[PDB]
């Protein structure tokens, strides 16, 4: 649970040094991008359900995954899958606000692959859906903030894979 | 967290065991928790061979 | 009742070979920065295209 | 930081960050330039702040430097001044972050336990941080000192 | 808004030695949000609260009541 | 890898029991039906290629989406590997019909199959349907050949389908 | 208000108001004039915003006014426009407050349950409020409209 | 199945299946032949049931087939008809099982979440199943139709 | 807990098709065996205490296990052992009624070896006592049910070993 | 078993079972009835076989049961007879199976290790099994006894 | 492993459509920068050793990391650390040539957090070093190649984080 | 592996300090214990098979472990168990010679608990068996080095637990 | 150490320590006191050894300390002296261990890689350690100097 500001100061703290000028430059960078990050976060908040719905339609619906015997087929499984996509999008938004994928590490990816492998969830199909969510999010929040959201979606994909 | 906490504390099992007057207490352990406690030298005693 | 085998990690087999990937693949597996000649071969393709 | 406290509350309530919390983050990122400037002055003058405030601490509380006090002798006094330096470093961190949680995480949680173990008197340490606040206020402008003083005030309040 | 009510909860007959006086007569403070659960518990006990009052002065504000 | 005889022996050995009359009765049942099992496996072995081809065509007509560009069998590279999986199932199922026990299927085919299919991206539901289509074709062929009890030939395919499928309770 | 929410939250922890929360209420005090100005201009255009945004809602979703839609008949169309007006009234309250505590209590908690009982489609309500957000943004000053859009975003996000 | 529902509720209390539950299973297995016949008839007439019921649903609730609804165009309308086929199939499974357990686990758990995240009116889905119930009454004998109507009623009960 | 009927309908559901005539044949078969299964369950339920009493007497009583230091010595441990024998009987009866070993796999045998090895319970003796229960049960319910109760009891023994 | 040996070899080939292999296991299941009879004679007469083999062991090798020997004692000699019983049970398993691999799996893989640990003369164990073979051959016909001897003699050879 | 051409072709192939004009534009951009990519790659190959030398000197050297017990103290550890920086540079060069980050995900980032967390390697210090390598490399190869190589260095940095 | 010498020098190396006089006292103590340790190692080396024989007799044999279905039943498994007990004896003697339990931690304990739980090995019986080995070894090598062997035997017990 | 070397080799051979290896560690424990004395004198005179040997290194190769050399300037030349101090410390570790094992781990692995990338001339480093060896020889008795000479020699050989 480190944001960019906390990460900068934490590294300084471990070294035992007052904030250096280079660290000030890194903090300035976070403050500089803050406005676009906050704006995109509010946009995702408003369109949260739609982002997930579009991603499911773009990557998962009318496919082997949702047709009978595909592990998203039963209604309980469909509800579970969209719940997980909601979880991914919410923590990606938190990560964009903070500037750090550490929240994704601690709250999503610390045991996710083992749970998915045990349950039988197809990792590749989830990765496809998360990638589609990246495309939809980029359109909704704008390309400039879309690059920022993209890195955190990629973090989820790298950990999940 | 607040919703999950109230779900656990409102559950029928919290009222059935621990009631509404009792501090919660460890009621069960997984077998590899009993492995850690009860199979160290000094706690194994005779447990395992006649 | 069918217990699993290790854990399933997504595996990406190569559908087809191309000159970019092929040159880079062999360089990676021999642990050497793309040799000047092989780099020029990729450059032949890239100046073309 | 403001961003991490907002995320923590939203995370514990399964809530995309509320518009008010987003507004708080917006104001904080804008004031960033002023925040970093205040921190720069404080760290540049850290030697003066610690030295003057340490003199004030010993003057106000002679018992700490009297025989039988925690900071009796040159080495013990040196460690006391180092603790004051630590707390100033924490205050600079807090000013930059815009939240007191970096100060709380580093050095303020369990401070009673740690100092009680060491034998140090907690209210006397609070006197030292209060003296540091006075020196920093002299080194800062009025608008700057009000913001930085609030972080000093949290430190003394938690260590009261 | 927290509602405080005194209920002579009907005897559950769950006491052998032990003690049932504290359960038998109850004066408690209950949040208005949690008062529904308290009423359900009173139904299980079998005894309605003899007296019911609410600490907050006004029962309803359509807006910002909190 | 256990036959019916080896399975009964394994259970009794773990319990330390000489084979009693119940064990002899079940062993006799396997021995009596062994001739029919051999004939059925011979039919499958003789028509192995034809069964695979017919089952594949039936599966793709049932589920066109696989052959379409989205599906996993789209190009001929994957079409060959998919046909090979059909051949795998028929080969091990014929082994299981000879064996009279589904432990062969469990140990060599089904174990790790879901992990492998999830990682490679292979869709499991269509594969279950393909195994079922093989089951019906094979049952027709052995029934034509003269095997009266097709319970021996269908049960291994059914076990593969149940283990490979999810619960959908 | 932000002050009221902050005071209650501090009361739970039995803490005097922390430096960050003091800063937040300080900024609420500072921006009060802009808050009142935003409320006044939106109030001036209160009828216009609701009516034209309602037209936009109907235009985007023809099923709303088609047979089988909840807003069928002139009286039901009036009720739908009234709901848009109710949310605008709450949004102006919330903009003045600086906090979503009014918006939440008055008109958002249990909105799914209330509209489910009525038979109304909450997603259709969401599209209508989105149209209101755009209309209000155009009538409001662009810099001020950025802050108001966040509060409209909260309302539409809660709808589902 | 009725067998597993009896076992599950007895396992919770850690008892051997009580005589009443055993009697229930005895009756269910005896009348299983009748149950299989009922499911056979519905399976045989599945095409007609879906077609007639779909026409009735669209006629009663034209908004769904109008523009701006979930099923606009032959592509979306075909998928809606397939969903009606799904629920007919689940009802057949329910008749054969003798309990609502197959219906519940396969297709009544998370229906609100799935259809809400698909943009589909769940009350309209409920009416579609009601139409299928009427068609099934026509195609079944009176005593059988009452029993199958129970499974249709459970579907609509969870739906709305 | 999947039974025969639930398993059949589930398999048909995975394929997606309505219930087939062949599936109807399998369901008819289970309905045919319903009479013996239900009758045997009633017999087991009434005589459950006697089944366990006879099995304990035949295998476990008056041995080292029931004498000091044998793991059935303490009154606590004796009562726990008879409770475990009741477990195996009850879930074997559930399995017989269902026609499916899924309940045994899911609830009874999962981690049974690990719990017993952690507690110090002799798994060999538990297997022998389950065999004694199998023989007593076979006598009580007759060869028809004893054959099936045999397969489920032996399922437990194979897993427990 | 013959069946598993055929299946294993065919699987390593990655070819369906050969017609010749199928005919081999056709012969195996044809002779199953004779195998079961031979196994049942040994099993039902196990008490006499073990006792007479024990007499021959304890007279051909009197040292092992003499004082100081491995089997000396009322209980030690009982465990030795139990071991002879174990190997007879394995031999019956093998006679049923038609292969010595059940015998070899449960015993004879590490018998040297086990008995060397237990301080036992494995030549003496071998002579005990040879006594079992002699006793069993007379309880079977000459044609049947030759089959039984094969499974009794693989054991002895492995014992060396 | 996928280059940009492989990704574009595969996306078009899944859709079934012939290569669209927008896809042509993406491919054309990659081909157009081909000369720059090859040129920069040769520069990296020649100057790779000094790029690493400068980067280590910039951040890691004369630091707590090289102090005793700092995890680059031992000569073993120092040699391995400079090797890993060589790895990142080499695979960043591969990623630049291909134009897609798949090399990084397939070979560099499918075991990186496991290896580094197991060894105790400080992720923050590695991130600082890789950022320093990005700056040094950008100076040597010029701005256009500094941007391209920079995105792949950033990929490795965020993945490590 | 770290022996006592290597542990002392590595502890000093981590700080960065030359070997202190206190560290010299530690090393001198190890050198003083050297004779008794080497003598005991030779004793165990010649009597290794007897130690395992006696221990398996004292604890493992004539129990439910060796009855059919008890996990040590079957000659394959009895051979395997005596092999594992000799593993423990050999590594424990290595540890007595070296003076540090790092051999046990590196070569025995790490991962053994998981493999044992996977294979079904009773873990209580293993602990009782190696404690029985401790009793036998104390007799053979004498009390003073029996004091020493016990430390490492107990280490193995704790790791398996 | 000798102990670790023996145990590693024997562990790879899965063999209780060979009788000769047991004698070897017996000799090592007897010789340990002499080793500790050698380490004691070298570490007590560590400042002398490093200082005068470093002067010798710079005198022998002034280009190395000249401008443009790696040890150019006060800071860099001090760090070069520190490297000489490091290698003396590692040599003391090796003397106590009785084998190169500690020095061949802490240093001497990838020294070529580290230094060559660092820019330093590794033959010059070898000359510096040679100078330290000469000084140590002066500070040690003849037989003692031979062993310490062996460990220094291993270092210089690895350098070359
Ligand atoms: C029909 C009464 C209403 C309606 C429906 C509609 N449905 C879809 C698409 C899907 N429906 C499902 C539902 C299920 N999956 C299941 O496994 C089960 C139980 C066995 C059910 C009920 C799913 C998974 C999909 C999508 C993926 C798929 O291929 O099945 C749509 C299309 C959604 C879209 O925008 O693409 C629609 C419109 N529409 C109506 O008007 C009715 C009120
Ligand atoms: C959706 C894109 C894919 C998919 C997923 C799917 N997941 C589950 C069930 C679970 N998912 C999780 C995942 C998380 N837990 C977390 O804490 C976090 C981080 C916030 C994540 C991402 C968990 C724990 C479960 C278990 C809950 C349970 O008991 O199921 C399912 C349900 C499986 C089932 O059988 O019910 C599914 C289907 N499925 C797909 O088809 C997509 C490709
Ligand atoms: C005597 C006062 C009454 C009585 C008793 C009776 N008991 C048994 C058999 C057993 N009793 C025990 C009891 C214990 N095991 C324990 O570990 C402890 C605590 C230390 C106790 C009390 C057990 C285990 C048995 C089983 C046999 C065995 O020990 O192996 C019998 C024999 C019953 C039978 O049919 O076998 C009897 C008769 N009988 C009376 O009439 C008195 C009222
Ligand atoms: C001296 C005889 C020669 C020489 C050396 C020189 N070294 C450096 C810098 C470093 N040297 C090290 C060496 C080690 N690190 C280790 O962990 C060990 C084993 C315990 C050794 C030997 C390291 C890490 C550095 C980097 C700085 C640091 O310590 O953090 C320099 C400075 C290089 C520079 O310009 O940056 C020099 C000059 N130089 C000579 O001229 C001699 C021939
Ligand atoms: C340098 C910036 C930091 C650092 C690094 C350090 N790394 C190691 C050891 C390993 N590094 C890897 C990583 C990779 N292996 C690969 O094949 C690739 C490319 C595909 C990478 C990135 C691995 C596998 C190891 C361990 C195996 C090995 O020794 O090579 C060490 C050694 C740790 C040890 O003592 O065992 C170190 C020190 N150290 C730092 O201080 C920097 C912050
Ligand atoms: C008899 C012909 C000879 C002989 C044997 C003897 N054996 C033992 C003890 C044991 N024997 C076994 C053997 C087996 N375990 C197995 O799993 C199998 C295969 C299924 C076999 C054959 C075992 C395990 C033991 C240990 C005790 C136990 O069973 O728990 C003894 C007793 C040894 C002692 O002193 O403890 C003897 C004497 N002795 C002879 O004189 C014959 C030549």
Residue numbers in the entry:
A (entry chain aL), I (entry chain aH), K (entry chain aN), L (entry chain aP): 1 to 71, 75 to 150, 161 to 174
B (entry chain aM): 645 to 694
C (entry chain aM): 2 to 50
D (entry chain aK), G (entry chain aE), H (entry chain aG), J (entry chain aQ), M (entry chain aO): 3 to 72, 75 to 150, 161 to 174
E (entry chain aS): 2 to 67
F (entry chain aR): 1 to 169
Quote the original article.
Cyanobacteria, glaucophytes, and rhodophytes utilize a large water-soluble, light-harvesting complex called phycobilisome (PBS) for solar energy absorption and energy transfer to photosynthetic membrane proteins (photosystem I and photosystem II; PSI and PSII). PBS is composed of phycobiliproteins (PBPs) such as phycoerythrin, phycoerythrocyanin, phycocyanin (PC), and allophycocyanin (APC). Oligomers of these α- and β-subunits interact with non-chromophorylated linker proteins to form PC rods in the whole PBS complex. Here, we report the structures of the pentacylindrical APC core and PC rod from the thermophilic cyanobacterium Thermosynechococcus vulcanus at the resolutions of 3.7 Å and 4.2 Å, respectively.
The analyzed PBS core of T. vulcanus shows a hemidiscoidal structure with C2 symmetry, composed of three cylinders (A, A’, and B), two cylinders (C and C’) with some PC rods interacting with the PBS core. The PBS core is a supercomplex with the dimensions 110 × 210 × 300 Å and is composed of 38 ApcAs, 40 ApcBs, 6 ApcCs, 2 ApcDs, 2 ApcEs (LCMs), 2 ApcFs, and 84 PCBs. The A (A’) cylinder consists of three APC trimers (A1, A2, and A3) with subunits of ApcD/ApcB and two ApcA/ApcB (A1); three ApcA/ApcB (A2); and ApcE/ApcB, ApcA/ApcF, and ApcA/ApcB (A3), respectively. ApcE (LCM) is a terminal emitter that is located at the membrane surface in the A cylinder and transfers energy to PSII. ApcE (LCM) consists of αLCM, and one of its domains exhibits a similar structure to ApcA, four repeated motifs named “repeats” (Rep1–Rep4), and “arms” (Arm1–3) that connect the motifs. The energy transfer from the C (C’) cylinder to the B and A (A’) cylinders occurs via C1α184–B1α284 (33 Å) and C2α384–A2α384 (35 Å), respectively. Three PCBs in the A cylinder (A2α384, A2α284, and A3α384) are believed to be the key chromophores that receive excitation energy from the B and C cylinders based on their spatial arrangement, which then ultimately pass it to the chromophore (A3αLCM198) in the terminal emitters. In the T. vulcanus PBS, the distance between A3βApcF82 and A3αLCM198 is 20 Å, suggesting that the two chromophores could form an excitonic coupling that eventually transfers excitation energy to PSI and PSII. Nevertheless, the present structure suggests that A3αLCM198 in ApcE could form a π–π interaction with W166/AcpE, as the D-ring of PCB and tyrosine residues in ApcA commonly form a π–π interaction.
